[PDB]
Amino acid sequence: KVTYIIKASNDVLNEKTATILITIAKKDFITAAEVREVHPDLGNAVVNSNIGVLIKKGLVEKSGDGLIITGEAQDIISNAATLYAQENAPELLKKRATRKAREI
DNA sequence: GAAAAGAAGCTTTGCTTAATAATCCATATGGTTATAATGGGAGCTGTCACGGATGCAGG
């Protein structure tokens, strides 16, 4: 899960901003009060510190009240589900028959 | 519960078309012409009433 996140980010993160990053990429332009709501274990300035890291890294930014990742963090998520497909859903990553097509 | 049937999701593929090599052609530029060749032309012609600025002149 966050193994693929922090591993896919080359360990630039910790688990707090990992699951917060799952929350931000999970619903587009959500409020940080919902982030603190689904993270009751973390403090208000702990969540705001982790958003200070993602803003500090420039991944998650605002749109007025908006909160969303950029495309590079999106590539980190898609690599995370890629390795999650390599190790957790192996037959989901498959391929069917391919047409040639035409023969002389 | 089977079985045709139609979509999701891959591919090709004949056609197009935009990028780019090739070529040719307008265009500029300059040169170069060795007998001699010596002051233009429409100007309107039938306003006109005022008016102010020159303009000239004698006391």
Curated annotation (Swiss-Prot):
Top-level lineage group: Viruses
DNA-binding residues (ranges): 21-40
Coiled-coil regions listed: none
Extra remark beyond the main annotation: MotA synthesis starts immediately after infection and stops abruptly some 4-5 minutes later.
Function per UniProt: Required for the transcriptional activation of middle promoters. Middle promoters are characterized by the presence of the conserved sequence [AT]3TGCTTNA (MotA box). MotA binds directly to MotA boxes.
The protein, known as: Middle transcription regulatory protein motA
Native organism taxonomy: Viruses, Duplodnaviria, Heunggongvirae, Uroviricota, Caudoviricetes
Originating gene: motA
Part of the intact protein present: 3 to 106 of 211
